[PDB]
Amino acid sequence: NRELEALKQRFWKHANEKLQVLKAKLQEAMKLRRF
Amino acid sequence: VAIHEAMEQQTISITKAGVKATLNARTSILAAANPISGHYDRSKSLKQNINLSAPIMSRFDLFFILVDECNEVTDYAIARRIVDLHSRIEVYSLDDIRRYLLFARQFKPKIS
Amino acid sequence: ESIENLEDLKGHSVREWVSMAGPRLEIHHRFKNFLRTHVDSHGHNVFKERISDMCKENRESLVVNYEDLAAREHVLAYFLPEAPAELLQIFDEAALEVVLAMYPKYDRITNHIHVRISHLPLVEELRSLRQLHLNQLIRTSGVVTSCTGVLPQLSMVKYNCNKCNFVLGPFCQSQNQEVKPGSCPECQSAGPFEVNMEETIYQNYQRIRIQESPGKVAAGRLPRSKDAILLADLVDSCKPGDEIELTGIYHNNYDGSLNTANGFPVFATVILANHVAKKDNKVAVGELTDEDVKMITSLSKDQQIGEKIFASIAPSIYGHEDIKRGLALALFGGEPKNPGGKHKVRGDINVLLCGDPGTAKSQFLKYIEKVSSRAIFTTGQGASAVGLTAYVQRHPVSREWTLEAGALVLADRGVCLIDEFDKMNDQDRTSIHEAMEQQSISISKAGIVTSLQARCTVIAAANPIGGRYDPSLTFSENVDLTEPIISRFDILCVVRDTVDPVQDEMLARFVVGSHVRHHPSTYGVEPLPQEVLKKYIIYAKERVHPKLNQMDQDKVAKMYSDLRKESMATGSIPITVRHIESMIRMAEAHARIHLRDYVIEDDVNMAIRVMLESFIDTQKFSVMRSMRKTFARYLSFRRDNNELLLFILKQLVAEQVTYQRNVPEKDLVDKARQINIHNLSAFYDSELFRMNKFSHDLKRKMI
Numbered sequence: 001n002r003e004l005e006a007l008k009q010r011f012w013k014h015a016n017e018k019l020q021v022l023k024a025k026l027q028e029a030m031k032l033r034r035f
Numbered sequence: 036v037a038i039h040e041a042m043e044q045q046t047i048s049i050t051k052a053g054v055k056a057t058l059n060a061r062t063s064i065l066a067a068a069n070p071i072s073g074h075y076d077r078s079k080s081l082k083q084n085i086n087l088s089a090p091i092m093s094r095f096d097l098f099f100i101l102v103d104e105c106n107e108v109t110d111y112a113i114a115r116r117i118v119d120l121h122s123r124i125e126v127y128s129l130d131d132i133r134r135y136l137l138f139a140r141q142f143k144p145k146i147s
Numbered sequence: 148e149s150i151e152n153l154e155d156l157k158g159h160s161v162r163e164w165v166s167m168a169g170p171r172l173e174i175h176h177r178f179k180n181f182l183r184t185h186v187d188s189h190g191h192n193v194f195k196e197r198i199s200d201m202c203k204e205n206r207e208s209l210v211v212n213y214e215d216l217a218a219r220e221h222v223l224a225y226f227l228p229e230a231p232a233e234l235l236q237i238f239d240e241a242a243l244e245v246v247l248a249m250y251p252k253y254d255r256i257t258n259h260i261h262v263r264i265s266h267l268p269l270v271e272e273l274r275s276l277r278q279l280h281l282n283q284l285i286r287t288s289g290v291v292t293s294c295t296g297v298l299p300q301l302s303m304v305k306y307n308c309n310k311c312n313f314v315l316g317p318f319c320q321s322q323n324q325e326v327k328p329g330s331c332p333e334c335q336s337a338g339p340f341e342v343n344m345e346e347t348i349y350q351n352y353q354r355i356r357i358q359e360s361p362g363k364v365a366a367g368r369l370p371r372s373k374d375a376i377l378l379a380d381l382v383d384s385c386k387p388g389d390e391i392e393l394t395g396i397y398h399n400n401y402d403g404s405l406n407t408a409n410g411f412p413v414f415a416t417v418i419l420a421n422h423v424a425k426k427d428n429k430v431a432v433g434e435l436t437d438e439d440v441k442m443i444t445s446l447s448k449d450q451q452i453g454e455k456i457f458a459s460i461a462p463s464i465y466g467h468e469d470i471k472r473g474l475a476l477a478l479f480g481g482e483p484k485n486p487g488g489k490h491k492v493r494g495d496i497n498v499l500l501c502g503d504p505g506t507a508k509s510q511f512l513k514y515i516e517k518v519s520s521r522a523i524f525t526t527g528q529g530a531s532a533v534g535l536t537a538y539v540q541r542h543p544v545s546r547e548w549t550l551e552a553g554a555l556v557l558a559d560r561g562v563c564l565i566d567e568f569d570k571m572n573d574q575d576r577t578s579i580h581e582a583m584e585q586q587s588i589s590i591s592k593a594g595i596v597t598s599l600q601a602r603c604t605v606i607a608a609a610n611p612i613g614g615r616y617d618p619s620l621t622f623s624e625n626v627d628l629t630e631p632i633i634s635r636f637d638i639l640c641v642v643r644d645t646v647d648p649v650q651d652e653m654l655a656r657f658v659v660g661s662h663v664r665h666h667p668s669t670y671g672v673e674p675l676p677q678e679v680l681k682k683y684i685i686y687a688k689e690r691v692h693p694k695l696n697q698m699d700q701d702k703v704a705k706m707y708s709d710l711r712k713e714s715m716a717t718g719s720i721p722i723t724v725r726h727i728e729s730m731i732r733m734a735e736a737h738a739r740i741h742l743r744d745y746v747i748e749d750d751v752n753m754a755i756r757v758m759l760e761s762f763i764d765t766q767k768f769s770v771m772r773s774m775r776k777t778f779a780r781y782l783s784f785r786r787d788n789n790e791l792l793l794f795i796l797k798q799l800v801a802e803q804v805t806y807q808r809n810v811p812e813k814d815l816v817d818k819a820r821q822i823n824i825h826n827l828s829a830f831y832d833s834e835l836f837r838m839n840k841f842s843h844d845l846k847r848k849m850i
């Protein structure tokens with residue numbers, strides 16, 4: 001299945017609601033501040 | 036006239052009373068045309084055969100010509116293909132071609 | 148006093164938390180510190196500069212970027228989309244007492260300052276708004292369809308008692324219901340009351356309707372829309388037809404009319420605005436920084452700036468240097484004026500790109516649409532006379548006749564782009580005469596008798612008769628346009644796809660290079676970056692106003708006169724004053740490109756060159772040789788003037804060597820500023836002084 005996985009890799013090479021994402025990635029920085 | 040913008044710029048820019056809009060037409064066009072006088076005259080050029088203006092003709096990436104030859108074997112083959120296909124109804128399936136085409140269109144080939 | 152804390156941990160909700168006194172004070176201090184300590188990547192104190200640029204213009208409104216608020220103060224960025232009204236009030240107070248630290252007398256100018264948040268990352272499609280977004284800060288985009296007038300809304304209302312002189316104390320007005328006193332505390336009379344119109348404090352109000360842009364998702368479907376409320380300084384931030392980008396609080400309230408309409412407890416919604424940008428006016432002079440001005444004015448020092456700007460227009464198009472030059476002159480534009488206060492003449496420059504298919508004319512128009520602010524695009528039959536100029540309609544709710552802006556009025560200080568101009572109807576095409584010269588649109592319809600301003604530069608593209616341009620005929624003989632419409636175009640451009648295999652190789656290699664370069668993944672000067680060019684154009688069109696004091700009047704008059712003589716025998720039309728004024732406008736435009744406050748001889752030479760090369764292009768192919776010789780020899784194709792400076796240098800060196808035997812660069816440029824040869828840089832980049840063994844150095848100044 002290595003060639004099929006290589007085709008998947010080529011496909012992903014060409015491959016290129018958000019408040020919670022913002023809050024999580026910001027809360028990481030606040031955790032760093034606390035530490 | 037609006038086909039000029041739609042074919043190349045892939046947009047339609049309407050500006051009239053009560054509406055101003057640059058509408059999207061990211062579309063591939065498959066045109067079918069009839070030559071003047073019905074029969075395609077081989078002695079005449081294609082430009083002389085059809086009434087499409089030169090700016091329109093420059094839009095198309097490919098021009099193809101289908102001319103009705105009087106060949107006996109071709110007529111028999113056409114009739115046979117129609118009849119035996121119509122009787123058959125009761126390499127790849129169209130669903131497979133659809134899936135492969137949708138998969139293939141995600142590739143963006145570079146130019147070496 | 149109330150003690151500082153870690154802010155992000157609490158048992159309350161966010162709104163309750165930031166409402167409490169302790170964390171409110173901590174948030175206040177944090178935002179104060181953020182304003183007074185935030186720095187740019189280069190180390191420039193950003194908000195000192197922004198507050199100074201605000202207090203100079205008395206704009207009483209401070210714009211803050213979320214993408215660095217999150218960088219500096221994390222928890223403020225955390226609470227902001229969750230509790231925006233409360234946090235924005237706190238930000239307003241902190242910003243006010245920062246501004247009154249920087250400019251202590253600014254309370255004389257304004258008692259309140261609004262913090263406006265920009266670049267909010269939680270953008271939302273307009274039809275994707277749901278109950279999940281309620282009472283949260285959102286960012287949306289859409290075209291403004293309707294606007295109320297600017298109206299005064301109560302903000303802090305004092306009521307006169309219905310039976311006596313007493314003023315009932317201030318009530319803070321809401322956007323949900325009209326606040327009321329009930330009964331007076333000095334005497335408990337009740338029910339109706341009078342507003343004290345003098346002591347009541349009002350605020351500006353403007354309600355707009357925005358819907359999805361027509362080309363965004365509405366592919367035959369009807370677009371969704373939302374109402375938005377602009378308050379205080381945000382009024383007049385937008386008009387109908389503006390592709391705005393709106394940040395605001397998604398707010399909801401009970402509406403009985405919607406309840407009876409739907410038969411369900413359905414709550415109306417509205418966006419309380421907090422920032423309005425525009426997606427076409429991506430840069431503005433009110434937003435330019437000191438560093439932008441500094442690098443713009445440093446670029447103007449370069450002698451190659453004209454070539455850099457010309458090469459910077461549509462850099463993905465090979466060749467067409469004359470087209471890029473004309474489009475640059477139109478994009479920068481001349482200077483409008485009104486000598487005597489009784490006689491207007493336009494400053495804007497009009498261009499027409501005629502030629503055969505596959506020559507990037509429409510592509511040039513699309514580039515100009517992208518680079519220039521307040522630009523619009525239209526095509527052929529898609530345009531109409533009425534839509535181009537202005538239209539009269541029954542107003543949607545009043546049902547009285549109202550006049551509305553057409554294309555050339557919406558582009559009143561921008562560019563109207565008309566593609567495939569030859570293919571319009573005559574009734575559509577003749578509608579732009581007044582707009583193209585008198586720069587007004589006069590309407591006498593349905594009781595409306597008024598004239599709108601249309602100070603618009605029209606750039607048009609067209610094909611000749613039969614599609615293909617034939618060099619056997621003049622421009623007038625194969626364009627099919629008439630003299631009144633041709634003569635209104637200051638610059639005429641002809642592009643021909645004639646075969647030349649070496650040029651075809653160069654063009655094709657460039658096109659393939661563009662295709663491989665822009666994969667999703669004649670220039671010789673290098674362009675500017677397009678962001679720099681947009682800043683340069685918007686700076687030059689506002690902060691520079693070229694004056695005219697001397698342009699060699701007899702030279703221009705002689706040129707125009709024999710240009711008229713030659714045109715009488717052939718097929719393009721220099722109507723009397725329009726071509727003279729076209730040259731004046733182009734000289735002013737070239738001065739504007741160089742950021743010159745006054746027009747010089749080089750600019751006049753450039754304008755003369757543009758006019759004459761365009762005129763030569765309109766001739767028959769057989770006639771171009773004689774015509775080109777006629778104008779080139781006598782009428783100022785001033786290529787270079789190296790010989791005078793060569794012999795001036797040789798004379799100065801001969802005298803100096805004779806003096807020495809029995810700082811020369813200063814000696815050279817002294818005589819060069821005495822004689823009218825002041826552009827000495829050409830002499831240093833020319834081989835004439837080099838094979839005479841002369842050379843230059845800005846430090847040593849020896850030659």
Ligand SMILES: Nc1ncnc2c1ncn2[C@@H]1O[C@H](COP(=O)(O)OP(=O)(O)NP(=O)(O)O)[C@@H](O)[C@H]1O
Nearest residue numbers: 043090463464465503504505506507508509510511
């Ligand atoms: N010199 C050039 N450099 C790069 N692309 C070019 C050049 N000349 C033509 N093209 C390409 O040709 C295509 C057509 O451009 P377009 O602006 O529609 O041509 P046009 O002048 O409008 N022809 P027409 O609409 O029939 O009058 C675009 O993809 C351009 O990029």
Ligand SMILES: [Mg+2]
Nearest residue numbers: 508509567608
């Ligand atoms: Mg075109």
Ligand SMILES: [Zn+2]
Nearest residue numbers: 308310311334
């Ligand atoms: Zn009373």
